[PDB]
Every structure is written in C-alpha cells, then in structure tokens.
Design a protein around this nucleic acid. Structure first.
Ligand code: ZN
Lengths: 112, 77, 75, 58
RNA sequence: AUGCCUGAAUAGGGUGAAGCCAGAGGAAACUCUGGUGGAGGCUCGCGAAUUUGGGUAUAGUAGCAAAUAUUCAAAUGAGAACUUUGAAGACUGAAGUGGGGAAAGGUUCCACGUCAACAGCAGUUGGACGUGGGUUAGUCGAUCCUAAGAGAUGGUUUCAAAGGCCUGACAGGCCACCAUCGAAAGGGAAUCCGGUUAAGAUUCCGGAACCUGGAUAUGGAUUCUUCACGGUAACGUAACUGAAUGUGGAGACGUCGGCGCGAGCCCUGGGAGGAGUUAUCUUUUCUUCUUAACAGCUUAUCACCCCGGAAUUGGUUUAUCCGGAGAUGGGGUCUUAUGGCUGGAAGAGGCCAGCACCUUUGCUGGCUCCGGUGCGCUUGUGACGGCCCGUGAAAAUCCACAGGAAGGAAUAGUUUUCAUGCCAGGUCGUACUGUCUCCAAGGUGAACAGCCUCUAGUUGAUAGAAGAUAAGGGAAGUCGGUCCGUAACUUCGGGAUAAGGAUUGGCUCUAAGGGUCGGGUAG
RNA sequence: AUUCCCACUGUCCCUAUCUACUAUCUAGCGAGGCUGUCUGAUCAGGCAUUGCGUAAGCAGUAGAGUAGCCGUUACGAUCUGCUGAGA
RNA sequence: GAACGCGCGAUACUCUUUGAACGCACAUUGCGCCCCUUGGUAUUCCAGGGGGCAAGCGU
C-alpha cells in the first residue's frame, strides 16, 4: 500500500524506463529500473534463433569467450544446421550439373 | 561476494601479502533434524571480492581457528 | 459469479484430462478416445459422471447389438 | 474493481469521445435523408461496365 | 486546409460476425438446436467534426475580492479569534487537500531577529524584510548517434583535381563519396542496501559490486617438437592464430484478443511480542514478524536432432490445427527468460523488555518463525490466434561468419575470445516549487456509480450579534398544462473389474502374478 | 406535431406554514418507526441538507427455528407481564 | 557594443567570456587536431603548462 515512482529524470511511460517494485532489507517497497531484455541471435538464411549461442546485449558479447557465441560446425554462429546442409548439397549438385553441361557441350561441338 | 568450500583456499587467501583482517562470525541455527547447532563463517576479502567459508562442524572450525596465522587480525563477530 | 468462459475452460480441461488418463490406463482404446474427445469438445457431457455413464452404456450396447438382430427376428 | 486504464480514460478522454460520437451520429442522421451520398462501389455499380454503356447508348 | 519525425493514449458495460465441435431433417446444396469462438460503419454512459507533448515542413458609502466549522485549556508576547502545544468536532478518501518528475520560475529551500511596507480585518505568522547556511556522481541525465527537416562546400553531390591506406634490399596499387546541425520522452557500457543534515543523496559516510580503456606479469593450454578435442546428430569445451576482401546477427520497430507462468499489492491460518475495549458478551479489534544491486550451483515452454514408418486415421488447443514435405510413440540437444538453495546477511532494519543520568545518557537481554489462496489489481513475460500494412524509423555501437595473407622452436618458439594479478575515470545539472506525465489500500454496494474508513495531509476562506407540506374542487389559470416455504441437482482427485452394512465369494479364453524345498514299499 | 378519454397535481379558486440562503447592525479595512452506514455486539448515539404511543432490563416453559438422546443440555427470533409505561 | 567580476581586468577604483570575431559547433562553458615542455612508478598510461589550426592523349 506504499506508492513508488521513477528514480530517474524521465517521468514518462516510455519503453526506455520501466519499473519493478521490490522490498528492500529496510522493510519498504522501492522502485527499480529494469533494462531491456536481450534477443537471441538469428540465422542469416531462415531467421530462426540460433541454437547453443548465448543471448546477451550487443556489448556483452565482447566479454565472453568464443565457445559461448559459436558452434563448432562450419558457419557456426552464423547459420543453423539445416541451412548449412542445404548449402552443401546445393553446391555439390550445382558443380555436378556444371560438369554434365560441359561434357554435353564438348560432345555437341565435337561434331564439327 | 563469493563463497568458497575449500579450507586450504581460505588459508591461502589469508596468507597473501595484501591481507587486512579476517572476520569470524557465529550463528546459532537449527538444522533439518531440529537440533540447534553452531555455524561459523570465516570471511576474508581478496583483491576485489569477499570470500566466505561456512562450516557447520564445531571441531573443524576450532581446528581452522587454531590454524590461522598468528600475525593475522581476527574479528570475533 | 464465475463467467461462462472460465467454467467452460475448467470443465473441458478436466474432461480431457480424464479422457487421457483413461486412454493411458487402458480402459479406453484409441478410437473410443478420439470419439469421446470430439464429443466432449461439443458439450455432449456436462460432468465426469456423465462421461463415465456414457462409457459404460456404450460398452453394454456394443456387447449387445450383435445379438439384437436375431433377438428381434425370433420374436 | 476498476482497472487503472479505465480510470485514466474516464478521467481524461471520455468527454471529447462522447462529444465526437454525438457529432458523428448527428451528421449521419442529417445526411441519411439527403440525395447525393453514395459509395464508390455503388457509383461503379450504377455506372455499369463499358459494354453496358454501349448497350445504353444504342 | 494538408502534412511529416519521435513519444503518451486509443479504456470500460452490453450485444454476440466468420470459423469450429456435438446433434436432428434432407439425395446434395443446405436449414434448425446447444456449445465454442471473440469480429465490427454494432450499441451505452459535395458538406460538420475527428486526443495530446517535443521537433519540423508546405462616504466611513458600495462593499469584504466568495474555497464549508469551529470549540476548550495552557505557553509566548506590550498586545492573541488568527502564532505554538494538548484535547474535542469536522474535511480530502489512492480518479486525494497524498508522494514525485519535464518545462518554467531563480533562492521562493533552512536557521536566527523584526513587523516600516506587503500577504484588501488583525497578526508575535510568512513564498515579506535583514543576516547567514545550503545543491558533492566513472555507474542518474546532458555530453555520443541519427529521425522529419534544416544547412556549408562546387541548390544538397551537382561535368569539383573534394581522401585515406597499403607494398617495396620514389615507383606501383586499393577503394569509392561527401561537411555540419537537429531528441534531458527515440537508440545508449556500468551501483545497490543501510545510515546520516536545520536544510544534501542511486552524488555524502559504511559495507558490498559492476563498466570501459591501458601497460604488463604468472599459471594453463597450444601433446614430438609447430594453430586442441568429443558426440550418428542437434551440439558440448577452461583455452584452442587468422590480412585484404565479401556477408550475417543484435541495435531494429503496427495493433488487438484469450490462455499459461513469475513478481509486487490485496485476502488468510498457527505462533511469538506490543496497543485498545470489557456494566454484560466477545480465544476479540489494531500493529511488527523484511532481505537490495551483484555473484555461484541448479532449473524451460518453443525450436531442433536420432530411431521408426502411420487408414480401423490418429495427436491435440479455451480458440480445429498438424502428420509420407514423416504423425502418435521412445530417447536426446539448446536458449536461462524466470523460479529454488547459497554468499552479500543479520553484523543491517524492525518489535519488545530491563538498568544507568540536575549532563551526548547509552548499556544490556530476547523475538524477528511456519504456511494457504485467485474470473482479484499493477507489471513483466511465453506460445498462439485475428486485423491493418512499406517484410512496419535511421544511425552510432558490439559480435560472428566465409576467405586463406602472414607468422611460429633447441640456455625461455607462436597465440593468449582460459584463469589470476595492477592503474585510472575529466566538464556541465543536482537546493525548492511544479502546459505534459508517474504511483494508487480496504469495506459496502451485492447494477460503472455513490457512501465510509486505513496510511498521508488539512482546519484555508475578516469576526461578533440579531426546497417541502396543505381540507374540498381538479387546468375552472394562462395566447398556449433483491427477499419468506419447496424439491431435484450440483466441485476436485483416486480409483478399473457386479455391489458397498453385509453371509463377499463374482464369467470364458488369453504374456508374468516373490524365491526355494519336498513323493511310496521291497531286494 | 395536433385533437379527444381516464387518472393526478398549489396552475388556479386562495392562500397559509416551516427550513436553508439572503438582507441588517457592530470592530477593522475601504472605492415513535424505517432504509443505508459507523462506533467489536447490546444499550446509547453520529452521518446521509427533517435521509424517508408502551422505554432499558428481567422473567415465562408459551415460542419459526438452531443445537443434545431414541422422559430429556443449551441457543432462540417473535409473543406475553412488569408497562397508558418511558421520554 | 554585451556578459561576469575587482575606473579597471585574476597584475582587476596586464587586459576574464564575447563581439566584424577566426579550429569545429553553439539556446551546450560541447567536441577535435597539431608542435614544444613538465610532473606522477613511466618507451606505451594519466594530467598540467605554453604556442598554433577561419597535374595534362595542351604545344
Ligand atoms: Zn537457418
């Protein structure tokens, strides 16, 4: 039944400043400003949240190790597993089709 | 603040060149069996943190107290 | 007091939970479970007693329809 | 128990909202009986297609 | 009149659209019935109108200055209706007469002394007068970035010689594109609790902690000498080099609805204290029983992976959506949002009791515990569903990925996104009040409402005296008149097996139904 | 919008009474009952712009019903008496 | 000419902040760069001081 308000300069209900109410060890209710939550990194091909990569603020990534923001597979930390598998399969099939086209062309101008 | 479960780590903390004081705090508290007992907290602050060792055994606390350096200041409670 | 949506939600949740419990326990097979699930979603049963009574009456009628035909033909 | 948003809206925005609702109702009632107020789809339906227009011209 | 950029707001009651589920009629189409669902030019309190801040375009007469209620005793003072204390009466009633902020004001904040003027009576009072005191930041803002737009350079990148970098025992090579201003409500690295003054607090004091930048040292790894491994996989790790060049993520983005979860508040049981009432009754009414940032361990819906191959179609939401483009089922991986335990931390804060004094007069001893609850209010969050629409502002800032340049060993090879250790953080605002804005108890109402009270504030406003009803007629008037008596029902789980006061024993076939041991007379 | 029917009414015959507010002077300046709610409950009171004739207490074996046994604890509206009482 | 201070400018009864006003901005005591020098452990860090910044396919 004790009423609390903002503790900073901004007096408006903006997304920047948001308030939680906590009971301090002094026995009173007090306001506390909450920071914006972090966002999971997303795959660069399909846009789904990357698996096994920590969710932090943009500047909090510079203070953790590489194993907390990467995956041991190729493109790990940038693309998910299915996208990488699709990339591998597509690249191999494209190269095989290029070989087949080159052989067919070598045959078709071999006539003259 | 940090908690440590290692007695020798606490002793190593108290043996460094830049050590000021160690605090020994006593709490009379009950366990799950309902019988009350004496719990001792040994607190020493390192470079940037305060390390606390909690011991629920009286004999171990006595042995650790006897094993503290004689040139180390100890705050009782 | 309690609005219609809350009562309906509680009733449907308890009905579905009971149906799942019966299906896991082996008292109700897959097909009877599916039929009863669709029926309970359609306000066919008003409480647990109605569901149990419908189950047991369905079991009796399934036991009896096979002899029903000759039973009526003989008379 | 009244919600905070309801209290805020009733203290702040109720009067002008009611006034604008009244004005809209009055204008709609006034123009209900007037002739010359039609929607674009209705105007197109009354106009008809091209082929309907050569049919009308003939 | 029409705009644009960045914010706040777009609430509540009622009704009940598509779609879906279960039924009945019909050969379909379809039509009724019940539920569900929660939509709108739906309702309720050529024209007009269409919330809001900041920025930015095209005669000692009239009278008393109007905000209700004051009374008693004491103190000060020359002087008291107005100052102060106590008592009584009354008021605001969380949508305040309560606590804060932006802008604006500029000392109005606090103390001491005073009533010449002012506060339309008075005044010993003061937002007055005179003299002093008071505003403490690495973490809160500005400072940084860009938005609409503004605006230099030669109208906003244009027939401009508009600039930086690299290689090499001056020549060669690479790249394109324009300054700057514009937000104390947008984006943004990091601090909490307790205490403290006459007036200062996320700024001071005590304790505790984070952020950024920098130079460096030690341990460990880099396993034969040269940039590490494991798992089928999702992926895991104490590390585990990476130039030019080319990309990806966060920043970074419409609105609404129900459902699930967390926290604060509200409600509530036991117990340990303190207070009130008690002619009578009342195991009774009020109040204390709190745990900050930060840190370690652990904890997930969703999503993904592996096995497997599904119609007698199953799974499944409050909302009928999903499955050979791989369901049900079985087993795993991940994000740590958010709970739990612990350190911070009981030493703090709170509630009590007792002992010291013409004095800073503080000392001592206890208790600070264990639970329940939800169409409740506030707020955050997850998976969905609906509708509008440029796939829903930009930039500073951080991270990652492809690529393979270059470098690395014999009296300290190379790297140091692993661990520990050292140093520093400037300028301006901060007192006080306050067209836009923040917080928000309970009970009755049993229909938003109104009424009453808790915490907290008031007693301000010159003072004293001295609409309703109605006999008979009835428009003759005027231009116009929720609570007492019934019955059936009715909530969650667990249970299987025909019942649940009795004498319990209860069908056929079909995997297992705790282990073990034991068979005569004669030669 | 107008006209007729019934019912009602201080519109009128025909005015009368009460409350609040106002106006005036003075000191100074100066152009018994009931509804809702609250005192923990009775009793007794406050508020809601009058809000809209048998007291308090005790007793009865009479008393709707709540609560003990298969003649019987207790609570108990209402009723009766003290009581043309009480004020 | 203006602002702030003790006629004058921190040397104040030499010349602060500005102003045609000149490193860039500006309704801010905001933001830089270059050269010398000094101090605090100091080759790196931090700070103070002084002084500054409105070629050609032509002959
Ligand atoms: Zn992907």
């Amino acid at each position: 039944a004790q009423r609390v308000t903002f503790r900073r300069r901004n007096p408006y209900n903006t997304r920047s400043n948001k308030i939680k109410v906590v009971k301090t060890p002094g026995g009173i209710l007090r306001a506390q400003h909450v920071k914006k939550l972090a966002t999971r990194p997303k795959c660069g091909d399909c846009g789904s949240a990357l698996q096994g990569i920590s969710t932090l603020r943009p500047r909090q990534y510079a203070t953790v190790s590489k194993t907390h923001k990467t995956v041991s597979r190729a493109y790990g930390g940038s693309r998910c597993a299915n996208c990488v598998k699709e990339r591998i399969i597509r690249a191999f099939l494209i190269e095989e089709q290029k070989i087949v086209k080159k052989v067919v062309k070598e045959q078709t101008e071999a006539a003259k | 603040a940090r908690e440590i479960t290692d007695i020798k780590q606490f002793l190593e903390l108290t043996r460094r060149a830049d050590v000021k004081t160690a605090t020994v705090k006593i709490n009379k508290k009950l366990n799950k069996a309902g019988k009350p007992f004496r719990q001792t907290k040994f607190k020493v602050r390192g470079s940037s943190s305060l390390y606390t060792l909690v011991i629920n055994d009286a004999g171990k606390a006595k042995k650790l107290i006897q094993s503290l350096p004689p040139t180390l200041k100890v705050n009782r409670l | 007091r309690l609005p219609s949506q809350v009562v309906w939600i509680r009733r449907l949740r308890v009905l579905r939970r009971l149906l799942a419990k019966y299906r896991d326990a082996g008292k109700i097979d897959k097909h009877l479970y599916h039929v009863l699930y669709k029926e309970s979603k359609g306000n066919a049963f008003k409480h647990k007693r109605a569901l149990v009574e419908h189950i047991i009456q369905a079991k009796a009628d399934a036991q009896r329809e096979k002899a029903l035909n000759e039973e009526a033909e003989a008379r | 128990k009244v919600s905070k948003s309801t209290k805020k809206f009733q203290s702040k925005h109720l009067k002008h909202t009611l006034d604008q609702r009244r004005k809209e109702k009055i204008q709609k009632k006034r123009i209900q009986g007037r002739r010359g107020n039609k929607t674009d789809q209705e105007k197109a339906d009354a106009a008809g297609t091209r082929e309907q227009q050569q049919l009308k011209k003939s």
